[PDB]
Ligand code: HEM
Ligand code: HEM
Ligand code: HEM
C-alpha cells in the first residue's frame with residue numbers, strides 16, 4: 001500500500017530529527033538483549049555473554065549504525081521500497097543466512113527506540129505511520145529469499 | 147510475486163480435478179474443530195457444541211462450499227489476486243467483522259484437505275505452488291482492513 | 293520462565309505506572325487500534341474517538357488486571373484464571389492479537405519512562421507480557 | 434493441555450508412521466524446504482536434492498524424537514529436555530519456524546493416511562505438535 005500524504009509527512013519530518021548512530025546502536029543492542037539467541041549471527045564480534053558485554057561491544061554498536069542508516073534510505077524511496085532493498089534482500093539470504101523473521105522483530109524494536117527518544121512527536125498517528133513503514137521494509141528485505 | 151509458468155500449471159491442473167463442494171465443506175468443518183473458538187462467527191447456523199454437530203450442520207457445509215468456490219476464482223485471476231478480492235475484503239472487515247488472521251489459518255487447512263483428496267498429484271512442488279497461492283489469497287482478503 | 297531478577301525488574305518498572313492506570317491503559321489501546329487496525333473488529337460497539345469514555349474504562353480494566361498480575365507474579369495462572377476463562381469461552385480473541393497489545397504496552401512505557409525502560413528491563417517486561425498472554429490463551433482448546 | 438482423548442488419538446495416528454520414520458521424516462523436511470524456503474538458512478551445509486542422505490538421516494532423527502515424545506506424552510518436558518537445551522543454546526532456531534515443520538508433518542500424514550487423519554484426530558495431532566514446539570522453545574530466554 002502506498003503512503004498517503006499525511007503518512008509521508010509524519011515519516012519524513014520525524015526522520016529528519018533522528019540521531020541515526022545513537023538510535024541504531026540502541027536498537028541492535030536491545031534486539032540482542034531481548035532475544036538472546038540472535039547472538040548466533042554476531043559471535044565474530046567478540047564478547048556478548050551478557051547485556052553489559054553487548055552494550056560495551058564496539059562492533060555491535062557500529063553494526064547497529066549501518067543497519068539503521070540503511071533502513072533510513074527507505075524514507076527517500078517511499079514509493080519504491082521493494083525495489084530499493086532487493087540486492088540487500090539477496091545478501092541476507094545467500095551470504096549472511098539471516099532468518100527473515102528477524103526483519104519484523106528489529107522493526108518493532110526500532111519503534112520502541114523512536115518512542116523513547118522522541119516522546120512528543122511519536123503521537124498515535126505518527127506511530128501508525130512508522131508501523132506501516134517498518135512492515136513494508138521487513139517485507140522488502142524478506143522478498144528475494146528462495 | 148507473480149506465478150511462473152510451472153507454478154501456474156500445478157495450480158490450474160490440480161484445481162480442475164478438485165471437488166469444490168466436498169472439499170469446501172471439509173475445510174470449514176476442520177477449521178471449526180481444530181480451532182473451536184472460531185465458532186463465534188457461525189453461532190447463527192445452529193448446533194455446534196461438538197465435532198459431531200459441526201459435521202452434521204448443513205449450513206456449515208453450505209458455507210464451506212461457497213467459501214471454496216470463491217477462493218477457486220483466484221485460479222482464473224492469478225495475475226490480479228489483490229484486485230479480484232477487494233470488495234470481499236471490505237465485507238469481511240466492515241460487515242462480518244472477521245479477524246484477518248483467519249484467512250491464513252483456513253489456507254493451511256485447505257492444503258491439508260487437498261493433500262488428503264489428491265495424494266498422487268500433491269507432490270512437493272505442487273504443494274509449494276499452492277502454499278504460495280494460499281499466502282496471496284490471504285493477503286488480498288486482509289488488504290482493505292482499516 | 294521468569295527469574296528472580298526478571299520479577300524485580302518488572303515490579304520496578306510497573307511501580308511507575310502507579311497512579312496512571314487509566315491514562316496508560318487508554319493510550320496503549322488507542323495505539324493498538326491505530327497501528328493494528330484489524331484489532332478493531334473486536335470492538336464494534338466502541339466509540340473510537342480519542343479519549344472516549346469507553347476506551348478509558350476498558351484501558352483501566354486492562355491495566356488493573358496487569359497490576360494484579362504483577363502483584364502475584366509467582367502464580368500468574370491463579371491470578372488470571374477468571375480472565376483466562378472469559379477470553380477462551382466468550383470473547384474468543386485470536387491469540388495473535390495478544391502480541392499487538394503487548395507491543396503497544398511497551399511503547400507507552402517507552403514514551404512516559406524512557407530512562408527507566410532500559411534494555412535489561414525491556415527484556416524482563418517483554419517476557420512478563422508473553423507469560424501473561426500465554427495464561428490468557430491457555431484454555432482455548 | 435492434552436486430554437485423555439487427545440492422547441489416545443495421537444497414539445493411534447502415530448502408530449501408522451511405525452516402520453516409516455525415515456520415509457516420513459524425509460518427506461516432511463523436503464516439504465518444509467520447498468514450501469517455506471526461508472527455513473533453508475538453517476541448513477547451509479545440506480544437499481537439498483530429493484532423497485539426499487543428509488535429508489534422510491535428519492528426517493529420521495526428527496521423527497524418532499517425535500516417537501519418543503508420543504511414548505512419554507504424559508511428560509513431554511522430561512522427554513524433550515536434551516533437545517530443548519540443544520535448540521536454545523546451539524542451534525538457536527527462531528520459534529516461528531516450529532509451526533512450519535508442524536504444518537508439514539500434518540501434510541505428510543494427510544497424504545499417507547487420509548482416512549485415519551479425521552477432523553477430530555487432526556485437532557489432537559495439531560495440539561500435540563504445538564505442545565512439542567512449546568517444549569522445544571521453552572529454554573530460549
Ligand atoms: C531493517 C533491517 C535491516 C537492515 C536495513 C539491514 C541492513 C544491513 C546492511 C546494510 C548490512 C551490511 C551489508 C553489506 O556489507 O553490504 C547488513 C549486514 C548484516 N546484517 Fe543486516 N539489516 C537488517 C536487519 C538485520 C537483522 C535483524 C540481523 C540479525 C539479527 C541482521 C544481520 C546481518 C548480518 C549478520 C550482517 C553481516 C554482518 C557481518 O558479517 O559483518 N540484519 N545488514
Ligand atoms: C479464503 C478464505 C475466504 C473466502 C474466499 C471467503 C469468502 C466468503 C464469501 C464469498 C462469503 C459470502 C459473502 C457474501 O454474502 O456476499 C463469505 C462470508 C462470510 N465469511 Fe468468509 N471467506 C473466507 C474465509 C473466512 C473465514 C476463515 C471465516 C471465519 C472463520 C469467514 C467468515 C465469513 C462469515 C461470517 C461470512 C458471513 C456468513 C454469514 O453471515 O452468512 N470467512 N466469505
Ligand atoms: C494483557 C492482555 C489483556 C488483558 C490483561 C485483558 C484483560 C481484559 C479485561 C480485564 C477485560 C474486562 C473483563 C471484565 O470486564 O470482566 C477484558 C475484556 C475484553 N477484552 Fe481483554 N485483555 C487483554 C487482551 C485482549 C486483546 C488483545 C483483545 C482484542 C484484541 C481483547 C479483547 C477484549 C474484549 C473485546 C473485551 C470485552 C470488551 C467490552 O465489550 O467492553 N483483550 N479484557
Ligand code: HEM
Nearest residue numbers: 472475476491494495498499516524526530531534565566
Ligand atoms: C518437532 C520439531 C523438531 C524436532 C522434534 C527436532 C529434533 C531435532 C533432532 C532430534 C535433531 C538432531 C539433534 C541431535 O542430533 O542430537 C535436531 C537437529 C537440528 N534441528 Fe531440530 N527439531 C525440530 C524442529 C526444528 C526446526 C523447525 C528447525 C529449523 C527450521 C530445526 C533445525 C535443526 C538443525 C539445524 C539441526 C542440526 C542439523 C544438522 O546439522 O545435522 N529443528 N533437531
